[PDB]
Structure formats: C-alpha cells, structure tokens
Amino acid sequence: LSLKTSLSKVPVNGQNDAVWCSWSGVVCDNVTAQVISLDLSHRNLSGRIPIQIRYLSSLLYLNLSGNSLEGSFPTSIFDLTKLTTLDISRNSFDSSFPPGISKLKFLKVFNAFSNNFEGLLPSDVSRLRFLEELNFGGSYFEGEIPAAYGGLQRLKFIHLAGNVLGGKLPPRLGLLTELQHMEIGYNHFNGNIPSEFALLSNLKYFDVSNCSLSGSLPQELGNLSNLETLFLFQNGFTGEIPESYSNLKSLKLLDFSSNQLSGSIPSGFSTLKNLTWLSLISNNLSGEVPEGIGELPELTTLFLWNNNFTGVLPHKLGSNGKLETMDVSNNSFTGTIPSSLCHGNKLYKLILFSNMFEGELPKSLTRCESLWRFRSQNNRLNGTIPIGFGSLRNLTFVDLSNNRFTDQIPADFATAPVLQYLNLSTNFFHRKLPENIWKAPNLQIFSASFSNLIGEIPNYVGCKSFYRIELQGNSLNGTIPWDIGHCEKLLCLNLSQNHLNGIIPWEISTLPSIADVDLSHNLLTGTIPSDFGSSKTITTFNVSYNQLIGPIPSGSFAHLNPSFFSSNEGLCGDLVG
Ligand SMILES: *[C@@H]1O[C@H](CO)[C@@H](O)[C@H](O)[C@H]1NC(C)=O
Ligand SMILES: *[C@@H]1O[C@H](CO)[C@@H](O)[C@H](O)[C@H]1NC(C)=O
Ligand SMILES: *[C@@H]1O[C@H](CO)[C@@H](O)[C@H](O)[C@H]1NC(C)=O
Ligand SMILES: *[C@@H]1O[C@H](CO)[C@@H](O)[C@H](O)[C@H]1NC(C)=O
Ligand SMILES: *[C@@H]1O[C@H](CO)[C@@H](O)[C@H](O)[C@H]1NC(C)=O
C-alpha cells in the first residue's frame, strides 16, 4: 500500500526530485488507517520527517533508504507501534540516536546502515526481543558495544562495521543463540576475541577485520561449525593458527592477512574440503605448506605472499581444475613448479616471484589458455623458456627476469596477441634476439637487459606499441638499425653497455615523443645529428663513453647534462671547437 497506489482529484505523482516535508506531509494528511506499507526509497528526497507521520498508526513496513534525509532521527517514528521493519539506511541522519525505540516492540528488522550518527550506540535496542536484523554500520558511532545487546535472542544478523567503536568485545555477545551473521569490523576494538563466541553455534559469517584486536587466536572457535566466512585480517593477532580450526567443515572463505601470526599452516586445513579462498598474506608464517592443500576440491584462490614458507609447493596443486588466482610471492619456496596448476583452464593470475623455485618452466604452462598475468622474476628457474606462450590469447603480462634461463628466447613471444609487458632481464641466454620481436602487435614494455644477448639488433619494422625498451648490458654487436623511427610511441630507450658501432640513427630525431635515450658505453662513431637539437621531448641523452665526433647540437641540447658526453670532441657545453 505504498508508492501512492491506493489513494488512501488528489496527486499520487511520486517523482520530480522534490525536497520534502510537504511533498508528502500530504501523504500523511490522508488520515488513513488503510496504509500498511510506505516505501519512499530512492526518490532523491531531502528534508525532515514531519511530526504528523505518527497518524500512520497501522504502518508495518517503512523504507526511507537511499535518500538525503537529514537532521536528528525523528522521534515521531517511534509512535508507529505496529512497525515490524524499519529501513533508514543510506541517509544523512546525524547527532546521537535518541532513546525510545522500545515502543516498537514488534520490530524485527532495523537497518540504519550508512548514516551520520555519532555518540553511543543506543542501549535502548536491547529491549526489542523480537528483533532479528540489526544494522548500525557505516556511521560515526563511538564507545563500546553495550553488553546488553547480547540479550537480543531471535537476533540473527548484526552489522556495526565502519564506525569509530572501540574497547573490548563484550563476551556476553556469545549468548546470541541464533546469530548467523556478525559483521563488526572496521572499528577500533582492542583486546582478544572472547572465548564465549564459541557458543554461537548458528554463526555462518564472522568478520571483525581492520580493527585493533590482539592476542592469540582463541582455540575454542574451532567449535564454530556452520561457519562459512572467517575474516580476521588487518588486526594484530599473534601466536599460531589453532589446529582446532580444522574442524570448521563449512568454511568457504578464510582471511588472516595482515596480522602477526607465526608457526605453520596446520595440516588439518587439508580436511576443510569446502575452502574456496585461503588468504594468509603478510604474516610471519613459516614451515611447509601441507601437501593436502593441493587436493582441496574447491580451492580457487590461494594467497600466501609475504611470509617465510619453506619447502616444496604441493605436487597436485591445481588438479581440482578450479584454481583461478595464486600468489605466493616473497617466500622461500623451493622445488619445481607443479604442472597441474592450470588444469581446467581457470588460472588467470599466477604470481610466484621472489622465491627459490628451481627447474624448468613446466611446458603445461604454455597450454594454460586462461593465463593473463604471469610474474615469476627472482627465482632459480633453468633451461630453455618453453615455446607456446604466444598461442595464449589473453596473456598480457610476463616477468621471467632474474632467473637462470638459457639458450634461445622463444620466438612465439613476438606473436603473442595481447602481450603488453615482457621483461626477461638478467638471464644468461647467449643467443640472438628473435628476429621479429619488434613486430609484436601489442607490447609496451620490453626489457631483456643484462641477459647475455648477442648479435645484431633486428630491424625496427612495425614497432607499433613499444614505449619502453631496455637492452642494456649485453654483447649486441653491429649497428643500431636506421629505421628506429617506426617506433612512434617510444619514450625510453636504453642500449647502453653493448658493442654497438657505427652511427647514431638519424631517424631518432623523427620520433614524436622520445624522452630518455641511453647509448652510453658503446663503440659509436660520427656526429650527433644537429637535428636532435630541435627536439622538444628529449630529456636525457646519455651517449658518453663512445667514439663520437663533431659539435654537440644546440637548441634544446644546450640545457642537457654535460656528463652525457665523454668522447673526444665537443662544443661550448664543454670545451670550445
Ligand atoms: C528498502 O529498499 C531497498 C531498495 O528499494 C531494498 O533493497 C531493501 O531491501 C529495502 N529494505 C527492506 C528492509 O525491505
Ligand atoms: C615481504 O617483502 C617485503 C618487501 O617486498 C618486506 O618488507 C617484508 O619483510 C617481506 N616479508 C616476509 C615475511 O618475507
Ligand atoms: C626464512 O627461512 C629461511 C630458511 O628456512 C631463511 O631465509 C631465514 O631463516 C628466514 N628469513 C627471514 C627473513 O626470516
Ligand atoms: C625488469 O626486471 C629487472 C630485474 O628483474 C628490473 O630491475 C627492471 O626494473 C624490470 N624492468 C621493467 C621495465 O619492469
Ligand atoms: C658479431 O657480428 C658478426 C657479423 O659479421 C658475427 O660474425 C659475429 O659472430 C658476431 N659476434 C658474436 C656473435 O659474438
């Protein structure tokens, strides 16, 4: 009986983003006892609730959410005694929440999420003993959780996240026999999680993250079966993960990231067969990862980075065919990379950098049809980078730098359809560049620096998307290709520390956006083409330690660092000619 359906020659036009108190005011004028539901949500309304609203004495349902209602909460609403659900969420109500909610003794649902309330949580609420859902999150509430809130049985949902609450969590809250959902993180709570919370047998969702809590993780919480979501991240928990937590048979999501947990991932975790998401990022965890974690049938997300895990990755990880994102960077992992990681073609993000992984890149990875971002720099991977990556049609980011790869660079990389980043630096190839590397349709950053490259730099035909090129610190001999002007997007070029002889390619002056150029430590000869001096993008031009000849250009080279030169010949920039 809302939206102006039942009248209740009078308008029932609910739109035209009008402010309010009298756009309705009228809508309560209709003395009506035939109005049981009032849904004025999302009408861009603004103003106050008028006192006259008390005459809708038959109201059961009132939704005023998603407007711009302001001022203190309207006490008049409390005179709506048959109110059963009340939604005032997503508004701009401020000041302390006034006492008097008690008269709404039939209230089952109170949602006031996202408002401007301040002061203390109303202790008043604890006398609504039909109440089931309570949402007071997203405001500026202060102080402690009133221990009397634990007197709310039938209550199955409580949300108080995103306030400025603090103190210690009231152990009495554990008496909430029917609580299924508890979301009270993003506050300033301190102290430990109460042992008593282990009595919340019906609890399916447990937050309390981004707080200031501490202590060991309370073992007793292993009693909380039925629990599907356990978020305790961004706190200050210490000690080990309790082995009792392997009894959480319903657990789907686990997040202990950004704490100070130590010890090992308990081997019982291998029995949590419903785990979807396991995140233990940025802790002081150690020891090995239980083999059984690679056989969890539903595991899709695996975050273990910034710990100090040792040992092998579980042989059969990924064999469930459901692994999507894995990040175990910043550890001390060893052994080979399991071949089963991308079984099912669901793996799209594979981040393994900063470990001690050895052996050959498993060739199965080249048939990972969903792979999108691959970062495995800083390891001990050996052998030849396998051929097949260029056939992955969504591979966009590859970092295999600082490894121990040898012989040839796979020629498919050149024909990878969407590859945007490719490093490969620091790697001991002792082979030529693939001769059609610069035809890569998409490739913005290519950095095979200090990778023991040899031979001539192939002709820059194509060079469509390149804007950063790093090939410094190799043994590239021959001449810098004279067709470098095909690289119209180029910004930074480093060919320093090679064996490049011959002239500086004039066609560099043709580049619209070239900014940083380093050709230092080579065997270059000839002039710096004076047309360089009319560039209005070149910021760095290090060409020092060469055999160049003639005057340095003027124009926009007159304000360059003289250090950029160290060949026998110059102009006023240092020693006149
Ligand atoms: C209030 O309205 C919004 C959108 O109109 C809806 O999603 C929400 O469930 C409503 N609240 C209640 C308690 O029914
Ligand atoms: C993770 O690496 C960061 C720097 O990348 C470092 O500050 C931190 O100490 C590392 N943590 C562990 C547990 O190795
Ligand atoms: C991590 O463990 C390995 C040896 O198992 C070693 O790097 C060191 O003991 C630990 N590193 C840090 C930073 O604690
Ligand atoms: C390529 O990798 C090296 C070492 O792994 C790193 O120092 C460098 O910054 C990387 N280059 C780019 C462009 O990311
Ligand atoms: C340098 O280039 C010449 C081309 O004549 C080639 O014969 C020689 O092997 C190259 N140097 C190497 C590969 O070390």
UniProtKB/Swiss-Prot annotation:
Site (CLE peptide binding): G162, D207, W305
Keyword Magnesium: no
Disruption phenotype: Reduced procambial cells number, and adjacent or interspersed xylem and phloem formation.
Extracellular compartment residues: 1-577
Function: Acts with CLE41p and CLE44p peptides as a ligand-receptor pair in a signal transduction pathway involved in the regulation of procambium maintenance and polarity during vascular-tissue development. Mediates repression of tracheary element differentiation and the promotion of procambial cells formation and polar division adjacent to phloem cells in the veins.
Similarity annotation: Belongs to the protein kinase superfamily. Ser/Thr protein kinase family.
Protein name according to UniProt: Leucine-rich repeat receptor-like protein kinase TDR
Native species: Arabidopsis thaliana (Mouse-ear cress)
Gene: TDR
Whole sequence portion shown: 40 to 625 of 1041
